[PDB]
Amino acid sequence: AFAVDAAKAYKDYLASGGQPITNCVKMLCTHTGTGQAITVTPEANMDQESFGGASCCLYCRCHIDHPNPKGFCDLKGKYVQIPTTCANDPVGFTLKNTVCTVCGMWKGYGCSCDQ
Amino acid sequence: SSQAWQPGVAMPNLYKMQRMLLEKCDLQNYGDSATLPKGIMMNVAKYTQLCQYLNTLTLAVPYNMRVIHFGAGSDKGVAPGTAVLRQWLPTGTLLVDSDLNDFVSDADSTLIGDCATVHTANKWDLIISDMYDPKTKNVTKENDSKEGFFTYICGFIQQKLALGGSVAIKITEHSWNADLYKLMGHFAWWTAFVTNVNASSSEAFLIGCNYLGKPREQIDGYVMHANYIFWRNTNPIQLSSYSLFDMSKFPLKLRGTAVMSLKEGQINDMILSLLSKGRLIIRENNRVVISSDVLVNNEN
Numbered sequence: 001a002f003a004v005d006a007a008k009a010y011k012d013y014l015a016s017g018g019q020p021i022t023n024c025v026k027m028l029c030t031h032t033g034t035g036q037a038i039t040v041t042p043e044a045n046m047d048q049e050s051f052g053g054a055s056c057c058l059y060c061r062c063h064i065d066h067p068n069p070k071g072f073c074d075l076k077g078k079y080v081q082i083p084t085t086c087a088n089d090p091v092g093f094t095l096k097n098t099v100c101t102v103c104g105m106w107k108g109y110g111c112s113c114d115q
Numbered sequence: 116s117s118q119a120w121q122p123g124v125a126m127p128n129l130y131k132m133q134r135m136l137l138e139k140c141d142l143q144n145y146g147d148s149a150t151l152p153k154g155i156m157m158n159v160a161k162y163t164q165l166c167q168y169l170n171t172l173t174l175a176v177p178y179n180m181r182v183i184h185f186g187a188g189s190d191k192g193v194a195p196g197t198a199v200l201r202q203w204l205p206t207g208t209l210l211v212d213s214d215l216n217d218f219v220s221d222a223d224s225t226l227i228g229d230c231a232t233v234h235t236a237n238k239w240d241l242i243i244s245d246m247y248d249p250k251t252k253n254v255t256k257e258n259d260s261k262e263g264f265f266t267y268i269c270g271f272i273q274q275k276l277a278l279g280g281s282v283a284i285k286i287t288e289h290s291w292n293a294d295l296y297k298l299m300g301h302f303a304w305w306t307a308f309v310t311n312v313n314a315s316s317s318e319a320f321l322i323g324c325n326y327l328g329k330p331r332e333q334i335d336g337y338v339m340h341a342n343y344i345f346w347r348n349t350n351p352i353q354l355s356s357y358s359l360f361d362m363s364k365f366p367l368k369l370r371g372t373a374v375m376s377l378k379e380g381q382i383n384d385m386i387l388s389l390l391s392k393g394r395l396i397i398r399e400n401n402r403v404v405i406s407s408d409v410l411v412n413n414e415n
């Protein structure tokens with residue numbers, strides 16, 4: 001059965017030197033928050049930027065079905081914290097990375113559960 | 116002066132009391148732009164300053180609060196203003212937004228269509244509108260009261276704004292409506308607020324604070340708009356992004372304001388007093404249900 005692989009197309013596009021999706025909605029905040037990945041209000045720490053979640057979701061932004069089977073979106077209606085070094089491509093960041101189910105930080109960008 | 120550290124400037128009361136004739140708006144700093152913090156959109160900054168100003172008023176903030184946001188889409192296809200409102204509002208606040216054109220939103224629900232097609236079963240505690248048609252800005256034509264979405268908004272406030280609730284409705288030199296100013300006299304307090312990041316525009320937000328459902332004051336809206344423009348013409352506002360750098364006290368405090376269902380005959384001067392103080396909301400507390408009328412056509 002056929003299904004479009006949007007994640008693959010975007011990853012391939014980026015590696016090809018394509019310009020990342022823009023107009024992700026950056027929030028003003030104190031940058032003294034918890035640093036968790038996806039929160040109900042902006043929680044950036046001094047190493048992060050907080051964004052409106054919908055605008056950082058590849059499926060929301062491209063107007064396509066979410067891979068969740070109920071079509072739920074993990075980001076819409078929440079705020080996503082992005083390492084300031086990756087804030088040039090929030091959509092790529094959220095697509096490529098994973099949130100630790102235990103501590104709520106990004107695996108490899110705040111999660112310390114393996115130490 | 117000291118205004119540069121505020122989020123913006125509210126129309127001083129003395130200007131509200133005048134009887135000016137409408138003139139053209141000529142801003143000293145017209146065309147100047149504020150320097151925004153790195154990476155921050157104009158409409159995030161603008162909504163942040165609005166919300167910072169709204170924090171200084173007597174908004175009713177109940178549990179199960181309901182907010183509707185018209186004109187929430189952008190030419191970018193996202194909803195920056197909705198994202199700021201949802202940041203500002205207490206977690207759990209029901210937020211619905213709408214625009215003529217498709218956009219992606221953080222709102223709990225989004226209706227796409229002309230605002231006149233929007234209907235809601237329930238009443239609202241706060242109505243925000245950023246609706247605007249740039250075609251209104253015709254400096255070669257007389258500047259008359261506009262209808263269109265302003266006619267909808269006046270009716271929507273009178274029918275679906277809970278007593279005690281508040282509004283902030285974007286206007287400009289040419290995008291304005293006389294009945295909307297007249298309806299400001301149906302709130303306990305009102306103003307026209309100019310954000311400091313957009314001080315070189317004739318834009319303002321007409322804010323109505325604590326709806327009473329009846330006139331506290333009879334306002335001639337043609338004169339009041341002339342008064343607003345007179346204020347803008349004689350009081351340059353220094354562009355400023357200073358307040359954007361202090362977000363420590365941004366979140367709207369969940370006051371848990373009381374909600375009661377009351378019939379019109381039960382609204383005495385003691386009730387009106389509580390409404391006026393941001394201490395009471397009158398509406399039901401049932402389900403929030405919305406819809407948009409769709410016009411059906413077969414072109415075959």
Ligand SMILES: C[S@@+](CC[C@H](N)C(=O)[O-])C[C@H]1O[C@@H](n2cnc3c(N)ncnc32)[C@H](O)[C@@H]1O
Nearest residue numbers: 158186188189195196215229230245246247264
């Ligand atoms: C200045 S923009 C909104 C910017 C947006 N609030 C943001 O946060 O970036 C004006 C909006 O008003 C909308 N709108 C204008 N006229 C309308 C009408 N009759 N009915 C419904 N929406 C309208 C436009 O489609 C347009 O998106």
Ligand SMILES: Cn1c(=O)c2c(ncn2C)n(C)c1=O
Nearest residue numbers: 140141142143145254316317
């Ligand atoms: C607010 N404003 C001005 O202040 C202005 C103008 N053209 C010149 N000036 C000064 N226009 C079109 C305008 O809208």
Ligand SMILES: [Cl-]
Nearest residue numbers: 377378379397
């Ligand atoms: Cl009533």
Ligand SMILES: [Zn+2]
Nearest residue numbers: 057059060073
């Ligand atoms: Zn999504």
Ligand SMILES: [Zn+2]
Nearest residue numbers: 100103111113
């Ligand atoms: Zn972890």
